[PDB]
Structure formats: C-alpha cells, structure tokens
Amino acid sequence: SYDNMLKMLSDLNKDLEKLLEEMEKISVQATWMAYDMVVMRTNPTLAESMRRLEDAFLNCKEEMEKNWQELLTETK
Amino acid sequence: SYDNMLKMLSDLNKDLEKLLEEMEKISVQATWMAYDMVVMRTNPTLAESMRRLEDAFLNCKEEMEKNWQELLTETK
C-alpha cells in the first residue's frame, strides 16, 4: 500500500504543481506587462494602453474567482 | 501632467495588485486543500477525494490558461 499512497501523492503533487506554476507564469508576465508600459512612456496612446491592460487584469481576476468558486463546488 | 501620470499609475497598480492577490489566495488555499487531505488519511474515500481535487486543480489550471490567452488577445 505504501507504494500506492506514494503514487496517489505523486499525482496530486504534480497537479497542484501545474496549477501553481501556471499562476507563477501569469504573475511574472502580468507584472512585466505593467512595468514595461509605464517605462515605455513615449507610447502615444499610453492612456488607452494602460486602460486596456488594467481592465484585462480585472477581467482575468474575476474569471479566476469564478474558476475558484467552480473548484470549491466540485470538491465540497 | 505629473499628477495625472501618478493617477494612471495608481490605477494600474491597484488592478495588477488585485490580480496578484487573487492568485495568492488561490495558491495558499489550494496548497492547504492538498496537504490537509494527505494528512487526514483516515478518510475512507481518500482515493476518490484525491482524484476529485487533482482533476479540479487541472481544470482550474486549464481555465486560467484560457483566461490568459484571452488577456493576450485583448492587449495585443
């Protein structure tokens, strides 16, 4: 059984890890999208590009919150 | 204009922050859902609950990747 538990744990760890790594990628990329925009200020449409990016961030945050509520329902 | 740039930057920072904080919450909660399950081993249906949770993790990861492609499209 010890090997069976080790296999189950391995699979849960792999799947949690894939989720965490996905979120890590989003985090780093979103941070550089923001910081790059504020440093590339010569952009002529700075106002609109900042608005588009920040509303995209809010949209993604809200979708992720709905994904998370879905997970909570699937696992309750 | 300096004050206006400060205001735009403030709003982008707020929205990026809300995204990052959402992902932080998911990260911490998903980690404790996994670790609590592996320590509450007396659970009679451990196999099924581990399967449900790991598949929920994979589903959430895949949804987040689709959300992220949506953001990349909105901001291209």
Residue numbers in the entry:
A (entry chain B), B (entry chain A): 10 to 85
Quote the passages of the study that discuss this structure, keeping the authors' original sentences:
The synaptonemal complex (SC)2 is a unique biological structure, formed through the supramolecular assembly of largely α-helical coiled-coil protein components, that binds together homologous chromosome pairs during the first meiotic division (1–3). In mammals, the SC is formed of at least eight protein components: SYCP1–3, SYCE1–3, TEX12, and SIX6OS1. SYCE3 is a small protein of 88 amino acids that is essential for SC assembly, meiotic division, and fertility. Thus, the role of SYCE3 as a synapsis initiation factor may be achieved by mediating SC central element interactions.
The crystal structure of mouse SYCE3 has been reported, revealing a compact four-helical bundle formed of two helix-loop-helix chains interacting in an anti-parallel configuration. The resultant structure is more complete and covers amino acids 10–85, which includes the additional loops and short N-terminal extensions. The SAXS scattering curve was poorly fitted by the crystal structure, with a χ2 value of 22.2. We modeled N termini onto the structure using MODELLER, with them adopting largely flexible conformations. This full-length model fitted closely to experimental SAXS data with a χ2 value of 1.46, indicating that scattering data are well-explained by the crystal structure with additional unstructured N termini. Thus, we conclude that solution-state SYCE3 adopts the compact dimeric fold observed in its crystal structure. The Tyr-11/Leu-15 and Trp-41/Tyr-44 interfaces from both chains are located on the same side of the SYCE3 dimer, indicating the presence of a single self-assembly surface.
